[PDB]
Every structure is written in structure tokens, then in C-alpha cells.
Amino acid sequence: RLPPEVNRILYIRNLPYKITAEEMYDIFGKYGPIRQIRVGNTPETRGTAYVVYEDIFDAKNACDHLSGFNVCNRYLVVLYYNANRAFQKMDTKKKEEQLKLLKEKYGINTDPPK
Amino acid sequence: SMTPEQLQAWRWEREIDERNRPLSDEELDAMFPEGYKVL
């Protein structure tokens, strides 16, 4: 029984640059079957990632437990995915089009984070 | 026949089936801004 903002996709910030695929699976996979992980690999995205769970209840669990999580000298910031936030970096026009397309086609919530 | 509260439980059930529904890679790929590598 769970809040509308919870989601299988977790956005992660303050991630060490050196972190390996195996370590990502280790850390996140503890809470259950991982669908896929995407790690930022450009100047503007490094230090961030999206982790995707197969099941939403595992994702709630990971999200409840992993924010503030110490790996290396760092404390991870982990948030539920939010399309509005996710497409921030697009200029005012393109963001509007992209959001309208995901809502039309997939029915995803398109408002900014609650 | 389901009382008001167990109808709510039934609706919660339907709601999460939709929120826990399997996603294609195409659904998934569209969720994402540039600059990420798939592990």
C-alpha cells in the first residue's frame, strides 16, 4: 500500500566516479532483481545514475534504505524518478514537447517533484 | 458483496498492478535524458 511518487526507477546523485558495474549491482541489487542501471558518463551527468528495479516494492525498500548510504567518502542521495526533473536540462520548449510525448504515449506523471 | 473498504482494497490492488506492470525496453528508453550508459 504506497504513495504516488514511489516508482521502480531511482535517481541517484553523489555517486563516486570510479564506481564499477559490479559494485552498483552489489549495492542496489540487495533489495531485489535489478532491471537495468544507467550511469552518467558525460561532464554534465557524471556522479549520477538511474537504477531500475523489476518490482516496485523492492524499489520502495531500496529507496527507504539507501539514501544517506555511505560508499567511499560519500553519502548517496537517492530519489524516486520524476520525468519533470529528469528532463530539466532541455530548454523551455523541448522539455515541454518531450513531457507531452511521455504523457500521451505512456501516461507518466509529468508535474515537478512533490 | 464487497463492503466500501474492501472495494478500496480491491482498487489499491488494481492500481499497483498497473504501477508494477512489466516495461518494454522502448517504454524504458524513453524515460531517460542523454548522457547515460547502460550497464
Query: Which sequence spans correspond to the domains of chain A?
Result: 3-82
Query: In 3D, which of A93, A70, A95, A94 has the Cα closest to residue A16?
Result: A70
Q: Within an 8 Å CB–CB cutoff, is residue A2 touching chain B?
A: yes
Q: Do B38 and A2 touch (CB under 8 A)?
A: no
Q: How far is Cα A23 from Cα A29, in angstroms, rounded to an integer?
A: 9
Provide the resolution (angstroms): 2.5
A chain contacts of residue B38, beta-carbon cutoff 8 Å: 36-38
- Give the nearest chain A residue to B31 (CA atoms): A83
B35 CA: distance to closest CA in chain A (Å)? 6
Fold (topology level) of A3-82: Alpha-Beta Plaits (3.30.70)
d(CA A84, CA A96): 9
**CA–CA min distance A42, chain B (Å):** 6
* Structure determined via: X-ray
State the Cα–Cα distance between residues A99 and A81, nearest whole angstrom.
14
**A31: Cβ contacts below 8 Å, ≥ 6 apart:** A53, A58, A59, A61, A62, A65, A66
Torsions phi, psi for A59 (to 5 deg): -60, -40
